[PDB]
């Protein structure tokens, strides 16, 4: 279950109980489509069915012509494996590898082993069910069903070409055109990873797609091969907690904790994700990626329970920005109401049930459903869980608004204290 | 080729050898689709083929009804040309110009000359191959092929309508539906520009789409005309270099160069792009746009070779943020490792090959393939090139951590030096 606590000492909420799934590695698979080489239709006539076939084959030719025209780095592995594929004598190895069945494990020149799927079989249909069936003497097809089937088998290449032209070679997330669900699940169940990671990643294909990349690789020698870059979750089932902060001001000077975001346990340290877009929450997991993360010693947990600890000084922002605002955390809401603005929390049926005063306050989602600040209306999350409210005395009251350095952006607690001491010693 | 250098004096990397392609101008073309006006089907019957035809024509009517419901500015030129089109007596000129062929050059009321292409000919099919073929006496069509052909010719308008409804009138990038590759290439080969810019922009249609805008213009008088806003590259083939910076700290105070991004030569000055998403790199070119750029004197190059130059002071950020991090530049990687965090560089087959010490260090992509910082795993680019490592002494060591102004965000070298001098004079 998910449990939330609210420290009034620093006006900050912590939501714990989450589990982890960290994108730590990249795996590169090579998806190959077997195309066919055709010059032109020998026969010509006024039949409309052959006109439809000619139009469809011309669209296929245009599609195959289009594909011949194509901090950290998120696509470095795919670029490396594409450079490997461009090496001579490598495409033929793949093409001769998965000839009897559409699943192979191949070793390239660089020594890296990759999985190969033959996801489409367009060559067989074009060269064995269109050219021989089409009788060039009469230039007519008896059944329109053949044309309808061609339109039902050539769509996938057209959609792949369209997506690659729109996104300019690299696309994300991988769509159902580029990788069907059955194939994605099969590749997941055959990827070189533990059975623990294969049971968390089969049930969450909704997010594997969002965190995957796909890069156009090769069209040469009647084989359209592109690299799909799946993630490998190297950290699974470790506790994580989200930290939300709100402005805290006197009734002025404002001190806001400036380390909002996700924290996850990782090999004895804490992986810190400041960006909210980085992480995603399905039920109680965080599907974050370490590419947008920092590494911190395992004492940042002490910041949440003691703002004045001596082992790891926290980070704050000091400013005279006296503006009311609210943060809709999970299982509740934090409101900071100052000035003449009216702030309230309203139930769905009992209307206004609170008359928020000046300062920082917190309301659980048990009962409270909407929060009005000024006129802005926020809806609180309705996730079931237990909330705890620890009372205290706001930190900003301990300081004095006479030598307060209301100019910093984010230094630390210790830096603010030493600046205050220097200012006091100056007088 | 691409050449990288790493200055340890400021812990910054420069990647040179790139070429330029700057989006300097906008060109507006008018893409017109000739629709047809139809009231309703006179005949009615229980035949299923006529039901399919009625459904398709009703979808066409709904699509045509939908389109009647529709720092710097990136769409100012298109808005201006649309305002020109809304003027009376202008749509008829376009309609009567491209009457004999689907290519025209027209002069509007404002005097600006624009290219007009008729990309679709739906009116001819609807009014000359559907109404006369459909015999209203029997209300039946002999061949289902006519319906299948209608479904293969009406998809374009449906997709255009869908994209315009989703994106609310303005769309980017121009997808394959709204402008096919052959049409885009013909428009490129007939646009009013030099043959030099027509040979760089034909081979890079993958990026012209991404940097182009398309806006709905007019539906009045059975002509659906929308403006495609292509870019005009006014600066081509000038040297460009990318500048990457990493935190530099003592073993504390941290001084980071704060001018990351692209630099390009431009008419004797330097165009500076701070945003990384602004520029795109296909092989060795930068397809940037000047709308997100600054202009600097041609002495910012001296910042890279002499941090303490007297002609153009550089820009720095001073803070006590002692956090380890890495920057994956092209052809190598910069790693700044501080505190107790473990930082290493690992080969694919030889495993860990380095044991990075505290400070800033740099590893080329020759051999080094992965970089581990804490637990975050980064993959270095595998682009072939030459790396150079110039030794020196870190600039931060020259300062003293006693009067250091660890509060600024980005002032300059000169401002930091004068603040240090003022602090020294105060004592």
């Amino acid at each position, epitope marked *: 279950n998910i449990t939330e606590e609210f420290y009034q000492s620093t006006c900050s909420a912590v939501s714990k109980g989450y589990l982890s799934a960290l994108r730590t590695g990249w795996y590169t698979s090579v998806i190959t489509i077997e195309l066919s080489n055709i010059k032109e239709n020998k026969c010509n006539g006024t039949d409309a069915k052959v006109k439809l076939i000619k139009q469809e084959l011309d669209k296929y030719k245009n599609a195959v012509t289009e594909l011949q025209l194509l901090v950290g780095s998120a696509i470095a592995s795919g670029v490396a494996v594409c450079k490997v594929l461009h090496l001579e004598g490598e495409v033929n190895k793949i093409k001769s590898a998965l000839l009897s069945t559409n699943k192979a494990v191949v070793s390239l020149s660089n020594g890296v082993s990759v999985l190969t799927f033959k996801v489409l079989d367009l060559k067989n249909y074009i060269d064995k069910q269109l050219l021989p069936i089409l009788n060039k003497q009469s230039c007519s097809i008896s059944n329109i069903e053949t044309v309808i089937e061609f339109q039902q088998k050539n769509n996938r290449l057209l959609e792949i070409t369209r997506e690659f032209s729109v996104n300019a070679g690299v696309t994300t997330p991988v769509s159902t055109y580029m990788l069907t669900n059955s194939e994605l699940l099969s590749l997941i169940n055959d990827m070189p990873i533990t059975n623990d990671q294969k049971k968390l990643m089969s049930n969450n294909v909704q997010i594997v797609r969002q965190q995957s990349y796909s890069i156009m690789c090769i069209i040469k020698e009647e084989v359209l091969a592109y690299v799909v870059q799946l993630p490998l979750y*190297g950290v*699974i*089932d470790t506790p994580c907690w989200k930290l939300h902060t709100s402005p805290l001001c006197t009734t002025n000077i404002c001190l806001t904790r400036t380390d909002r975001g996700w924290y996850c346990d990782n090999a004895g340290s804490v992986s810190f994700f400041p960006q909210a877009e980085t992480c995603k929450v399905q039920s109680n997991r965080v599907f974050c990626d370490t590419m947008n993360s920092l590494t911190l010693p395992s004492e940042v947990n002490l910041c949440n329970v003691d703002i004045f600890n001596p082992k790891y000084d926290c980070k704050i922002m000091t400013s005279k920005t006296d503006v009311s605002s609210s943060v809709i955390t999970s299982l509740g809401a934090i409101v900071s109401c100052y000035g003449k603005t009216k702030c309230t929390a309203s139930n769905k049926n009992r209307g206004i049930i609170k008359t928020f005063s000046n300062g920082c306050d917190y309301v659980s989602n048990k009962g409270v459903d909407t929060v009005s600040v000024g006129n802005t209306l926020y809806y609180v999350n309705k996730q079931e869980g237990k909330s705890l409210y620890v009372k205290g005395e706001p930190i900003i009251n301990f300081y004095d608004p006479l030598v307060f350095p209301s100019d910093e952006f984010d230094a630390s607690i210790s830096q603010v204290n030493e600046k205050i001491n220097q200012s006091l010693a100056f007088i | 080729n691409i050449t990288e250098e790493f200055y340890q004096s400021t812990c910054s990397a420069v990647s040179k050898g790139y070429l330029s392609a700057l989006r300097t101008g906008w060109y507006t073309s008018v893409i017109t689709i000739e629709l047809s006006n139809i009231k309703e089907n006179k005949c009615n019957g229980t035949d299923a083929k006529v039901k399919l035809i009625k459904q398709e024509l009703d979808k066409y009517k709904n699509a045509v009804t939908e389109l009647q419901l529709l720092v710097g500015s990136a769409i100012a030129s298109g808005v201006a040309v649309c305002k020109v089109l809304h003027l009376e007596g202008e749509v008829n000129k376009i309609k009567s110009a491209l009457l004999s062929t689907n290519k025209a050059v027209v002069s509007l009321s404002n005097g600006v000359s624009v290219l007009t292409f008729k990309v679709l000919d739906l009116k001819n099919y609807i009014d000359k191959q559907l109404l006369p073929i459909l015999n209203k006496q029997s209300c039946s069509i002999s061949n289902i092929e006519t319906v299948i052909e209608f479904q293969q010719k009406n998809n374009r308008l449906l997709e255009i309508t869908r994209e315009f409804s989703v994106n609310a009138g303005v769309t980017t990038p121009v997808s394959t539906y709204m402008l096919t590759n052959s049409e885009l290439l013909s428009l490129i080969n007939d646009m009013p520009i030099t043959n030099d810019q027509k040979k760089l922009m034909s081979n890079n249609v993958q990026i012209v789409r991404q940097q182009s805008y398309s806006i709905m213009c007019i539906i009045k008088e059975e002509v659906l005309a929308y403006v495609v806003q292509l870019p005009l590259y006014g600066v081509i083939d000038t040297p460009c270099w990318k500048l990457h910076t990493s935190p530099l700290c003592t073993t504390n105070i941290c001084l980071t160069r704060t001018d990351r991004g692209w630099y390009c030569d431009n008419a004797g000055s330097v165009s500076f792009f701070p945003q990384a998403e602004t520029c795109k790199v296909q092989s060795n070119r930068v397809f940037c746009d000047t709308m997100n750029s600054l202009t600097l004197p041609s002495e910012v190059n001296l910042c890279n070779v002499d941090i303490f130059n007297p002609k153009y002071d550089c820009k720095i950020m001073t803070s006590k943020t002692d956090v380890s991090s890495s920057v994956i530049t092209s052809l190598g990687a910069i790693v700044s490792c501080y505190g107790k965090t473990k930082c290493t560089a690992s080969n694919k087959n030889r495993g860990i090959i380095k044991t990075f010490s505290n400070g800033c260090d740099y590893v080329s992509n020759k051999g080094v393939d992965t970089v581990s910082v804490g637990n975050t795993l980064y993959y270095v680019n595998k682009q072939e090139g030459k790396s150079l490592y110039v030794k020196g002494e870190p600039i931060i060591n020259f300062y003293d951590p006693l009067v250091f102004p660890s509060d600024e965000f980005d002032a300059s070298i000169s401002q930091v030096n004068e603040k240090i001098n003022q602090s020294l004079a105060f004592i």
Partner: T-cell receptor
Amino acid sequence: QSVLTQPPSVSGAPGQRVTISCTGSSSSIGRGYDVHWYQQVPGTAPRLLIYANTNRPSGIPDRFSGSKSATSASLAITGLQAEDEADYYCQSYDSSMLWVFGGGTKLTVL
Amino acid sequence: EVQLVESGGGLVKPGGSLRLSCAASGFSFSSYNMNWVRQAPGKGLEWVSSITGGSNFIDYPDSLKGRFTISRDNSRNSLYLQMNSLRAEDTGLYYCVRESYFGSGGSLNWFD
């Protein structure tokens, strides 16, 4: 009967390098899972020797080495001494058997 | 200072039930995985049971599936393995071994 195959015993003289092989199938070393080399001196709990198939934990002498290629892994000991006589186990994964472990190589000094 | 001390072993008649406990100290237990591995006297090693940090990814091999039940209690840093319906095998040493990541992604990490 183990998933992987290992020589029953290898021998050598002091100052001589010895190579121990770890061979497996497709759903094995193949597909590139990894191999890990564990040491066991009798009467003592097993100790990690080589992890990630090439690296080395701190506190292990540099004379040890490990590598892999195609479908076979190797562990090389350079400069054999009396303290290296032990049971050596090679480890990898299996899509149908999970953690496999080796059959045990008994290395002794002559 | 990673200490893994295991206890609870003793003589049991065939077909009996048994419990084995493992206490871990000196490291953050809640993030590292755990495993139980066998070693018959004079025979090779053989993996027996696995569990992850969140106690919701259980894993057994095919031969011992449905008999051995593993459960980690995170409150006092404890691991337990319950053995039902013993057979002639399973005799020997049982090791409570911490599965420790941070050797890159690398699937199988490095149980130290």
